[PDB]
Every structure is written in structure tokens, then in C-alpha cells.
Amino acid sequence: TCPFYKKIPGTGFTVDAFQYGVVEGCTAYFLTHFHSDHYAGLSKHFTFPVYCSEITGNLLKNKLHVQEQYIHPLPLDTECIVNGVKVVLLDANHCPGAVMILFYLPNGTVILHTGDFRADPSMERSLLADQKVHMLYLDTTYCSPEYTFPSQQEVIRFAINTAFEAVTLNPHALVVCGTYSIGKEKVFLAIADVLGSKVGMSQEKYKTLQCLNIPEINSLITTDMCSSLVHLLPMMQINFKGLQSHLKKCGGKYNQILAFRPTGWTHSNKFTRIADVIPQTKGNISIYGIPYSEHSSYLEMKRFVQWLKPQKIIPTVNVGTWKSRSTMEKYFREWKLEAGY
Ligand code: NI
């Protein structure tokens, strides 16, 4: 059945709740972003109102064929009324089109649902600064102190310098980047930019990127693989067998592959600096795992919450085990006692 942490009290609303059939008493279904664990269940047969960002509404219409009459896109940073309730959508710093949602309940309670987010100090100067938030529905993906990672900027600097060095030493090397969803476009776009190439990809993935309002996208991407020396492949193909196979397909245009797997966290982070990352190599193929995260680190999460000072926290991730739930609640209490709220 629909879990309680997907329901907004005092409303007929649900958030990221499309796989439970008709939720009893739901008058409006919000979708925070276009990732499959969140949209699971949506299709051309859905007939209730879906509220989302413009970019997520492009993806619903073009990729899932949801009929236009049930898509309700909202502008960001704008007070809007939905079924008699004031809401605002805020940038979540996750994938393209991802939002946080502020609900202003008729009784005076204010609720923030973060969706999936990467907390940032820039959020401390949005519409969030203007009033008190009483309840926080929090993306707790990496809510444990072992989760450290570098800034997105540091990671992109490493990837640009590594690619440019490799291809300038060997003009016959191919760069490959893995993907299995929207998000992390900066990885492949920044590398293609330093190399003076477009990124080549399948027709399905090009379609997906054409929904994202990225400026000058027609100048950066293409479906002509032959004209491109940065290729995008499914994340499943980023292994020695998959890459050997792909190289055969390029017809002796290339004699080396340098591949990137933008993972979330991996335990080489508790020890290793970004400066010190090395690839796995077999023959003329090298694979780099880079810690490009679109979720908060533990410290980023902790700073956001100690700034916001919510009265109650409801985790949305890692809620399926008692040991995880109990561990999170201990951190929440620590943060509250340290900060004084
Ligand atoms: Ni997500």
C-alpha cells in the first residue's frame, strides 16, 4: 500500500506515488523528477492531474506518452495555487527538472519535501529563507558520516584534464561515458567541449536530452557516431567485454578507449583524494570510476538541516530496515542538540 512518507497531511496530495494504483483520497499527484523509482507506474493510460516542472513535463509527454491534458507544469520560484493550497517548486540541485516542493497548509503548517537533492548553501537564499518550515520530508540517501565526496567542480576538472591529456598523447583514442538515466550530463558535455567534438549517442538517448532545455544543445550532441570521439553507452556496457566489443564496431578508427563510470559513492572515498584516482586497465582499455554525486554528502545534509531547523524530520530513503531508521534518528537528535533548536 502507499507508504505514509509519500502522503502530505491535511491535503489530498501524494509525492512520487504512481505505483500503488488509485490512492484513496488523492486529488493531485506530484512528481519531483524523472527517475524510474519515482515515476514508476505512469503511462499514456494515467488520467489524474500530475504536477511537476516544465522539464519533467516534457519527458512525461515525449518519453512516457502521458496525455497533455493531465500534465500540469509549474514555474519555479513562483507561488501557485493547487486544489486550494499554496505551493512553490524550488531547484533541487539533482538531475535536470528535479524540484523540492513547499506546501503552505490551510492550518498554517509549512512542509518542505526535498524530493532527491544535493544540498547547497545557495538554497539558504531562496524562498526558503522567508518563513519557518515545520516538517521536512528529507532525502537521506547518504545519511552516515562515511559518505564524503568532492565537489562536482573538482570531479569535472579531473575528468577534463584526464581526457584532454589522453587524447592529445594519442589522437586515435576514443572516450566513452556510461549513463542509465538523466543526470550527470556535465561529465560527458565537459569532456566533449575540451576535445572539440560532439557527443554521439543512440536515437533514444538523443530524444531524452532534447527534452531538457539545455542551452545550445544542438551544438553539443549528435546521433552520428562516426563524426564523434566522445560516445555515450548504457552503464551496463562499461566493462572490458562491452568496451572491447564497441571498439570492434568503430572499424579501426580507434586503437584505445578511455571510459568513465560516474558512480555515486564508492569506499575508495574514505581513503583516496580525487587527485589520487587511478583506472582499471586491460590491454588498450582503461576505466575510471569517478565520484560524481547528485545527492547530498553527510556534511552537506547536516548543514542544510541545522540551517533550516525543522520541528520534525521524515526520512524518505533507507527506511526499510530498523537499524537504518534508528541510526538516522540518532543523527537527527545529535544535529538538533549541537545547534540548539
Ligand atoms: Ni533521483
mmCIF file of C-alpha atoms in Angstrom, residues 9 24 38 40 65 74 91 99 106 109 127-128 139 144 146 159 171 182 211 235 237 249 275 279-280 290 319 325 329:
data_model
loop_
_atom_site.group_PDB
_atom_site.id
_atom_site.type_symbol
_atom_site.label_atom_id
_atom_site.label_comp_id
_atom_site.label_asym_id
_atom_site.label_seq_id
_atom_site.Cartn_x
_atom_site.Cartn_y
_atom_site.Cartn_z
ATOM 1 C CA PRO A 9 -1.119 15.588 5.783
ATOM 2 C CA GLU A 24 -7.693 6.573 -1.917
ATOM 3 C CA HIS A 38 9.925 7.905 -8.643
ATOM 4 C CA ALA A 40 7.181 4.021 -11.767
ATOM 5 C CA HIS A 65 3.359 9.480 -23.799
ATOM 6 C CA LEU A 74 4.600 24.838 -12.837
ATOM 7 C CA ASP A 91 15.504 23.769 -7.684
ATOM 8 C CA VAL A 99 12.429 20.010 -7.674
ATOM 9 C CA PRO A 106 -4.529 25.891 5.387
ATOM 10 C CA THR A 109 1.813 24.422 8.898
ATOM 11 C CA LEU A 127 12.150 31.484 -0.878
ATOM 12 C CA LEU A 128 13.058 29.075 1.940
ATOM 13 C CA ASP A 139 16.380 12.700 1.033
ATOM 14 C CA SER A 144 26.038 8.490 7.547
ATOM 15 C CA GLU A 146 31.401 7.767 5.986
ATOM 16 C CA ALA A 159 37.743 14.319 -15.879
ATOM 17 C CA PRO A 171 44.717 11.253 -31.237
ATOM 18 C CA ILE A 182 19.038 11.591 -16.889
ATOM 19 C CA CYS A 211 13.628 17.403 -23.663
ATOM 20 C CA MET A 235 26.167 1.908 -17.962
ATOM 21 C CA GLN A 237 28.227 -1.833 -21.359
ATOM 22 C CA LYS A 249 32.298 -1.668 -34.193
ATOM 23 C CA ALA A 275 43.945 13.728 -7.217
ATOM 24 C CA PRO A 279 41.849 3.389 -13.524
ATOM 25 C CA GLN A 280 41.377 -0.345 -14.017
ATOM 26 C CA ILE A 290 34.588 8.988 -10.626
ATOM 27 C CA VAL A 319 13.523 3.470 5.600
ATOM 28 C CA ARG A 325 15.882 4.041 10.731
ATOM 29 C CA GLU A 329 17.085 9.290 14.126
#
